[PDB]
Design a protein around this ligand. Sequence first.
Ligand SMILES: Nc1nc2c(ncn2[C@@H]2O[C@H](COP(=O)(O)OP(=O)(O)O)[C@@H](O)[C@H]2O)c(=O)[nH]1
Ligand SMILES: [Mn+2]
Ligand SMILES: [Mn+2]
Ligand SMILES: [Mn+2]
Length: 620
Amino acid sequence: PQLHNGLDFSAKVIQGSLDSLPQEVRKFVEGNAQLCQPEYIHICDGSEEEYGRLLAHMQEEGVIRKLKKYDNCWLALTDPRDVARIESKTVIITQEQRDTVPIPKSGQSQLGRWMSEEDFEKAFNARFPGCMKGRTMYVIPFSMGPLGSPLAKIGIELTDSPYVVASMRIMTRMGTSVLEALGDGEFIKCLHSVGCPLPLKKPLVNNWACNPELTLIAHLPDRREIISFGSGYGGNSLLGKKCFALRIASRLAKEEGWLAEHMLILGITNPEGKKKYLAAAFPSACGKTNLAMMNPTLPGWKVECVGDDIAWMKFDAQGNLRAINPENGFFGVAPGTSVKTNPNAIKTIQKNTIFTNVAETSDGGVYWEGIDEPLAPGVTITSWKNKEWRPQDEEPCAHPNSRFCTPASQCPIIDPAWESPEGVPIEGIIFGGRRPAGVPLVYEALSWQHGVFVGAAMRSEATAAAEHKGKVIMHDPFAMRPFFGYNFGKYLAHWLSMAHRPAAKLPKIFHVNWFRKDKNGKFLWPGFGENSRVLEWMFGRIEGEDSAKLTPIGYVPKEDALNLKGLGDVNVEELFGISKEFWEKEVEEIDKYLEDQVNADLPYEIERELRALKQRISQM
Ligand SMILES: Nc1nc2c(ncn2[C@@H]2O[C@H](COP(=O)(O)OP(=O)(O)O)[C@@H](O)[C@H]2O)c(=O)[nH]1
Ligand SMILES: [Mn+2]
Ligand SMILES: [Mn+2]
Ligand SMILES: [Mn+2]
């Protein structure tokens, strides 16, 4: 016991019991309760009633609105400063700096931000003492991946924001059963605070609590802890998504020998009755969600969805590379999602969905740019800035990074094996980014080493996901630039090593580019549902059909290899053109980038592929 009673927080528990919590679980709660000083402690159980009283509270507090037009849908407008995933204030703390990033040969590193325990201890004590003063601390027990699944991991998130608690219920498997499964096992320690203790010294915008000045998202892989402060928007507050399942998981996978990757997983079936699973890694806002729920334009072809952001993969006993979706919902970009682009999306977000920073229509509906849908006469739109918006203004009605949060189970084309703990065998890996010119529509890798190189050499123009602005093409190897959990050189090594495992069935590797333009500035490829035609060519190359043409960068489709029926007017000349003048400069940037950023931790095989390609391009 104790001498007085300053350490027994039982009297503050409004739901739950610290006596029912596992040993090292209760210590984690009480320790931080002492440090953050919350007014109440709410031990979540994930029940439908709990989710009810949670929404009502947020509504009576002025945080979220009800979209009367649809079944149980809610809007939320955030502070205009807390609108995206802050990549500049995301740090990983390890003892030695090399464990996190390779030491640059010259300038600063682009593959992560490292911070010492000394620097972090000072910044921590300047943020968390008393940050939950007057708020409720929610104890979220959640599971990444199916319960009882092998590659499944359990985490405890503490937060003072009911906006996180509700999202986590959509995005993860959160409740009481997750507590009884953990028992005395190991768990990830997640801590989150909006940084607005009461009384409010800073007036809030749109009733959105957040402290932008002090925002910090820190990772301590050595301690299995994630500590986020100030922000409360998606990737910053859903600690089980980017912080856990990608950064922390990547280090665990390296240690244990599996893979945690920023990739979608889709299964595709052909008219003959054969079905194959593919995985695609694209940067943020570049095509993953639209592709994972694609409505294909080719007859007799079916595409089911397993996940659209994170994949955990590992070689099974038979040498098959199996993958699972550790997430439980979809956290996609709203703008551009219309009945014509992503029709499967429209069928899912119509219920139990939490929209954030999208526009509201006066009849209780949602509206965003590119929705391609006429509104009824007399229907008025309120933008995400909570202002009466007309199409005559320049301000877009919905924020570019505005999101929807819908459960995966509601998807009409949900794969009947996405909850399967055994996973799905992966027979192909797809890379690509937003390349406005130069890169052909699709090509195939020449070997496992070349393929790993293709992903190391990914580049794309700056989209609207982090804080990058302008039409600048930057490097994003494996679409994982903002999510590397350890040294990128050893990351590359970890991938090349999969070729050494016994009886391994390595998948093919492809690179696509939907975003090529002409001299005028027009997309040479329709895309979206028409991308099914490039999936048909990949399905055949996996079966081993001779429809490829060797080129200085990889196998490209033969003449008359693509099912282009229904178009014909498409310019194949410029869509597959491979200019020497372009690739001679591309390798020059890829060379300078790898020599400077990866420096001494660059495996030799990747440099061998760089040389091999540099040569084949000069021989033209
Ligand atoms: N031109 C073209 N644009 C696309 C295609 N797929 C998606 N987009 C655009 O890319 C944006 C983001 O797509 P999304 O799938 O949400 O990217 P994600 O961040 O990987 O999930 C959308 O607003 C679309 O307008 C495509 O095949 N072609
Ligand atoms: Mn997505
Ligand atoms: Mn993502
Ligand atoms: Mn090797």
